[PDB]
Structures are given as C-alpha cells and as structure tokens.
Amino acid sequence: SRGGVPMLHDNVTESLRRITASGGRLNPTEPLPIFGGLRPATSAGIARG
Amino acid sequence: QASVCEFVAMPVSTDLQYFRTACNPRGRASGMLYMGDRDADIEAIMFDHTQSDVAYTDRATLNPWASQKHSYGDRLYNGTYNLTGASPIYSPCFKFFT
C-alpha cells in the first residue's frame, strides 16, 4: 500500500521493507516499480490451493 | 536378498506437522508443472528461484544443505559420465533428481 505518511529517513523505510518482505512470501518485487500495481514476484507453478 | 537401504536424509528442525503430518524423501509436496502455462521453465519451477513452497511454506525447503543442480549426497547419484558405465545401478534412485 502506498499513500500513508512515509517515515523521515528513507534508509530506515528501505530496511523495514527488506525485513518485512523477509520471513514471508508475498513481497513487492525488488525493483519497486513506480507507476505500477506492485504485483508480487510472479508465481511459478501453483500451489495446493 | 540384501533387503537393503538407499540413504537419503533430511536435516533438521521445526515444530509439530511435516515428520508428525504429510511427507517424503527429496523435497516438497510439489509438481514441476507438466502441461499448463508452458514447458521451458524447470530451472526456477525445477532449478533457480522466485516464491514460497510447493507444499510446506511455513519455512523454505527440506534439510539445510542440498536443494539445486550438481551437488554431493546425491553426488552419489547423477549419470552421464560413468556411473551408468562401470558399476551398474538403479541407484538408489534413477528417477528421484533425473
């Protein structure tokens, strides 16, 4: 989601995004495209459900 | 008739459902995707990486040290150069990694 008041230090926000996309599956793709839908890194073969 | 093994192994650790619920020997309830989207992706659906687990995404693959191309404990296994040539084997498995 984009639109909230961002944090002052962009480096902290970047590290937070790295640690949040960490430990988890669904992550904004690494380049972080501007003017995009921020689709998760497109899935390979599918799942079990 | 030596009714005997053929070692795989599955290092180590978690809670209580993958050797307490589902599971098998070289790693994940899965499926390389047959006929579907297309058939020239089996290097990041069968060799490199993009997402979470074809079964158990609670944590990333089976045992901390063998999950790609040309490696050891299965260096016991692969089969162009000579070990379908000098000691003939169905070998523990000859279609588990092939």
Added chain:
Amino acid sequence: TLDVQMGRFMETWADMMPHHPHWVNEHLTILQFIAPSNPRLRFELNPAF
C-alpha cells in the same frame, strides 16, 4: 616493530562500506533458519565443498 601498528592497520580500515553483508550474524532462535531476512545460505548449502 608493534605500535604504530595501531596507526597504519586500522586507519586504512578507515572509511566504512554500505552494508556488511554475508558473514558475521549471531543472535535469534530457530526457523530463522527458515525465511531469510538475512543471508547465511549462498555461502551455505552443505559444508564439504
């Protein structure tokens, strides 16, 4: 000879890189073996080779 050992061995350890990246972690519990925030696996897959 041993002291300005001090002087020419840390002050070329003078100006710091931008992320110290892939070997010196040390403190969390377990299934961070299992979803990387953090490196320890592409210099980590089996030790013997």
Added chain:
Amino acid sequence: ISLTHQLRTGFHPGIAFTVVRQDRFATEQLLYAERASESYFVGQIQVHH
C-alpha cells in the same frame, strides 16, 4: 524498529494478535421449485448474416 528486533529475537512484546482468514469450499446444491414458479415468454427467431 524495536518491534522488528523483538519479534525476530523471540521476545514477546506486550500485545496479542487475532488472525482472520477467508476460505472457499466447493459444494453441490439442492433446489426445489413449485409448478407455476415462472411465467415464461418466448419470442420469434431472427437471423443476422
């Protein structure tokens, strides 16, 4: 940031979470209808070549 540190390390900060998850199931239905349930009108066919 401190939440990142604690939640990773194994610490339990003084809050608790409630999870919610939506699921789908395929079900076969069972329909009953009386005699004059629908008054049904039919037109006359016309063809576009």
